[PDB]
């Protein structure tokens, strides 16, 4: 397997530069200008991630402009996406506008709306209705971002709670509550997500990371969101919590991809155990054909020091091992001191965890994991994949539209790159979150119709030769998918 | 393995209606006229072979006419096999035409040319020259179909041998000798040989059943015999003694394909061994891809009695569970009382040992054995067979001209039939010793060079509808190796 | 697999002395002398036969004391098998104790007890009282060894068919019929074997090859008839019709294994599916671990000849490569004119095919079947040969005192002799039906009860010397089933 | 594979309460008295470390002393390892104990004697006499950490060479420096390593933790340097540069098991590039069947803070799932704030990875590896392992008087703990470096020779039994040889 591969590998052999995973960078005050993209662009950012749980719809549209023309001086194709704010518990107001809380005194949270304004050190509000119920006692109750922590001791009535607090901390009107191994009830997409998606659509984003994803039927919600117009866009489910993590299955079912959100995820659950989700859940989307992005607290210390930690380089390095699609930089490159260097170090680790990954275990592993008998796309991807390794070719032209296929090819894991070719130029954008796939854009309004497709293998073919994949003489395997069905292994001119 | 897959066997599930194996009928008086051709072909006939060893030029002119009219009326192609007599050895004449052999008596073998009509019991010739440089003391030397058995002694000068007569046994004129364990010499390819190999390019033969073939230099001698004109007709090496089956890994490589004599390897060779030597030679043409024949004494009883024995039946199932493409018919057909019963036994036999054979394990061999990097065509060829048992696929569609393609996509063994699609005519009659493929015939001057493939794919796919191989919903893997491509099609 | 084991195969290269199928032979005029026996097994043979539906107990006394002499004289050990006559359907008498039967004659045959001395070439008697029921239109009726042919058409009323002789043929009184197809549902055990049974109880025998199986009850049916004191003889099942087929997996179930009977399963069965059967039957028993003998029509053409047939000897070669433990012979041995020359012929034949066949196959066939989890027993015995194969070992000793461990090691197939060492002598004679074994005896009574199992490993390991399976330097695998495992330096 | 097996795995169900991986605790200033000790070991630590490269005889002995009483109070056998302060490439002193080195400036690195105290930014001293032989112009120099970055341009002369300052850094005296793409030929046990080494046998050490081993040859001087009276000890050598990583297949044939010094490596190679390094030399000492331990920088931040990184964690956890058989504490505790807390939560993450780690993937890789014919003992072991997942058996015990065998049985990876039963107390501490075993003393003076083997197979089943491993009607399996499956009375 690949502890046998081990074996055989050297650090000091060169490392045949090309990376599969993708980089997913974070915009913001330090990355927002034109130049700065560019600069993030060359770096090895592929995707631009807008947080729009801070900033108003005309400091994200300048980042939807600006990415758009970095990506258009550089000419090449970069995803958009739209992080969602998602539903979200703040407490009432407070009388002062301020309530200090004091380590081992205590204090009642109360599901009663008269006490919204009326909120004081010793009572409070708690705009979460079932509040009595999913709290019981000897839980955690979080607020202000997770920095007060109260200790539930009993219930003064079936509104009140009588809590502990368990360190000093002031907060002040309306700061978010957490609630840690209790199974809350929110609605997926809230009022705000309803008007921030609608601008996402009319924007042409291109994927939408939804947050706190709990239920497939919670994906359906964003769907509706989304509306009509917006069918083609991609939703990456947010996995932010234990629910999220228990409904793992159908809700990859029913999503586009998913973000393993570690931080979030760790709110309610022991580091060492969101380690092993991100394993299941990296190796579920595998399985499934859909990309997967490790999320939160990537290379962390580059946010503000030139270098990153020894622990912070095998993190990142892991999560490829792991089998992720792409890593993703948060205040690395929000507003971070060091916006570029963190992007080509993060670049650098998967270029050196690749040259030692062994793609034949997932294939393998892949393989196995095929009912029999299957569809006739399922069968043709992997026997293409198959010549891939019988002929050991250097390069995979894939003519896929919509990129269905593509991410299907991809799935099954060769040991060459990938080169799509496609009419759609979204495509090329939504492929940034597949692992080991780069896009050529063939414009079927200014070459023509390509009815009968040997000019959009000829230029799969050429990208593949530009970027020294194959020269003369070399094997490409090339395909054609669903929408019927093609498989060759040519000889490289 | 097999082991697992008979676990799931039962022999009153039906039989799935398609035989992959061949039968090769030998053509005789008792199945020279048309009338009897067209029952040989309606009992299933794949293969017309003349053995040449008997018979003139009008006798298989005769024989080569009636198999095309036969053929023609019923609308079939049938391959047309002409069987060398190959380099022979035979004793001279006696006086008298008689010479009484007795048993611990004592004679003198001879390579002088001056005893050819003065032969006795005491010192008679025979034609092979080198028979005293090859032949040692000890060995033995076989007379009169092996009937009559010596064993040489000693060298009397350098022509003569000193023998013993093992066994009693009178001997009349010319009968031929066998050397068991000797290296014979001889020419690959003999007088009459040369004649009749360009008889057979004139008239147009599928392939050639080459005999006695004992190196591979020797399958070079027949190509040249061929000449240019007949570049394109097979040649099948019988492999019927020792030599052959030590160079057999050689011969197979310059061969068409192989044919496992059992009875003249018999000769020389322990009956249990022979059944060994039959497993390696069907597996070593397995693995190269190339047609491999089971040969002697097939059905051998039925050629005066109405029905076979159980040993026969299972002798004739064990061939195609060995691999083999082909199973032959020799007397049965040629001189037989029961012509159409014993075809029609064989496909029988050949269906039912079809049903129970797990050709998964044949495929996967198969694969195992290819060495990494393979070439395209190798490539193509097993991974749209991986397809067909990935998607459960009930039938396969090959345009191939040649037959090179059909012949290794054959190779990995998928468990549904092969249909191939050639603008060759002669492709489809030398594609009638390939195991699980059927042909189809497209004329490339009475309906367009096709260059798009579709209408080729088409009449494949509807050949595969007419004989209820696939219907509408159906997955139908597609092949052409040399440009390479596969496609999976789903049926309407 | 095997294919790839074919291409590196040569005719040419020396084949090992060590044969691992065995072969039973049928005791006969020819070969009940205790000259004729020793004779036999110094041929080959490891089993004696006895075909009780001909010959009286006194007859068959003579067989069994024979064989023991001449076993004893020879310093071996052979197995008795008592082969059991079964139900069987036979007509009434005749008026002058004959009638004869020609083509194209209309008869009709009765259920009506009152025509069981009445019978005419006409109308006649068949002591099967569900016959008209069973019996129907189209079917047919095989009388005195298979040799007349008769067609049913129809029903004369609820006791006589209307019949046509479809060839010539002369029966006297009380032959057998045949029901070809139809489900004669007889008994398991009749009386006859009943009695027999108990005779073979009382001198001994090691196994019972009982015929016409057809269901798991059956063999329960058998296990009764031998009671108590033979809850130690095997039975083997031997399958003659399509319900043995169709039920053989409980069959084998409840069976100490099977026979294949291909003769009589060709009277119903088409010959090409026999065939077939046959791959079935000896693959289940091969994964269920007991012993399957290929039995019917093996070497035919030796029983006057001095010289089989080609085809005969690829039967005997495939039934090897089948999977099958033994390979018997019948009138080639009971009454052939060369009794030692076929033995000889057919062990030399088993041992071609042995130096062809690829067991890592049988192993990792059996194993991949195995179902996880599995029993501590289960586990060791795979181990034990998976270690074989692993060090290359040339022979294993397996302590079993009943030969269950014996052959359940067996059954994963090594590459190398096993060497069962037991304290029942009987054991010895039990394992001669499974192949690639061979039993010594240890005498406990005159050695000791040897707890620690130190000698009896030495006896094995000394009698694998003896044998020339291993010298010193070679590791042996020793195994006991509490469960024990070695990988023995040898000395 | 591992990507089947995860789809499987919940980390809602239950983890058996076991912990295959071992931890390794530097003792020091925080951590030496019998008491900090005693609670070191009930937090998890199967070995205490002891660092040689500062301290005297006598503070060391202090620690031998208290491990040994703390342990002994406990009841449990813990192990006692001497970390060599091995050979050092240092520069002189200089004038005002300081030099600031600024970028673009020239200097002069020198070998001459004469400049040992002379020392200024533009010339000074390095005690490694073969400098200027060994380097090459192009070539890098890291002084201080690797923090002060020189590049070689020419050679003024046989002792002199003239390099360039690319970075600008402030260095103080007799500073270590590294040679990255050079072969030192430095002696393997330096005078002071000889003096410590022969203390350690005179002390009784269990094993050795060799540093700075760039060759085969260089582990054979360390033998040497232990003598006759110390063949027992285990010599488990610390790579730390690419010399160690270039010949480490050399270097785990000769030794008894391997150190990946992470912060070490990375002074020379890429950090990235450590990753994978770590990955490659863990794999090999699998194969091996011998013991490696994840080194440097664990839980790091836990030094001053009561919790660790979220890299850090995955750090700990991914070590473990590269195979691992130990993983090291160094200031966390040896001069840490949260000495037991550190232990505890490293045992979490170890206990955490392992309910996750799919062991038939090691168990059917390593068979996959091994030749055929194979020895005895090879052949055995593997099919006792192969029994554990047949049976689905619930403990493995195995009789081993010097541990060899124990070690090759948990090479194999079984799914359930191996208990070892040995008549001799140092293979019960030598063994708290090997994953997933655990050591049942059976004193053959005070119970018996038990030619037998009867009473040590209930003795290490006692302690299944009592463990919890198993009960009865559970199977498990036994290992001149022997194997067997037994049924838990």
Known sequence: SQLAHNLTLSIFDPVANYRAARIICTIGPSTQSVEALKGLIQSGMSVARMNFSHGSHEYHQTTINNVRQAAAELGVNIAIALDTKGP??????????????????????????????????????????????????????????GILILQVQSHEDEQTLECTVTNSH??????????????????????????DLQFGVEQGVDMIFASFIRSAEQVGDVRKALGPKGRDIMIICKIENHQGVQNIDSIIEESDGIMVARGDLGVEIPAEKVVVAQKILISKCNVAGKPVICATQMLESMTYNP???????????????????????????????????????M????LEAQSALNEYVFFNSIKKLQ??????????????????????AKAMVVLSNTGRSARLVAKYRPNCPIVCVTTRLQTCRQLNITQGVESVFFDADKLGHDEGKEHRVAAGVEFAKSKGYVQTGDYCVVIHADHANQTRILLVE
């Open 88 to 145: 979200e518990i703040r407490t009432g107001q407070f009388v002062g506008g301020d309530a200090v809380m004091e380590r081992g005194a205590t204090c009642y949270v109360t599901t009663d709306p008269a006490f919204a304004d009326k909120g004081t050190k010793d009572k409070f509000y708690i705009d979460y209705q079932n509040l009595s119920k999913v709290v019981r006692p000897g839980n955690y109750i979080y607020i202000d971002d």
């Open 170 to 195: 002031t907060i002040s009107d309306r700061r978010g509550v957490n609630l840690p191994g209790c199974d809350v009830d929110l609605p997926a997409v809230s009022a705000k997500d309803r008007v």
């Open 307 to 345: 270098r990153p930690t020894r622990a912070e380089v095998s993190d990142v390095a892991n999560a490829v091992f792991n089998g992720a699609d792409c890593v993703m930089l948060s205040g690395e490159t929000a507003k971070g001191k060091y916006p570029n260097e963190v992007v080509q170090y």
């Open 347 to 350: 670049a650098r680790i998967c």
């Open 371 to 392: 009912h029999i008998p299957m569809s006739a796309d399922e069968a043709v991807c992997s026997s293409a994949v198959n010549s891939v390794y019988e002929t050991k």
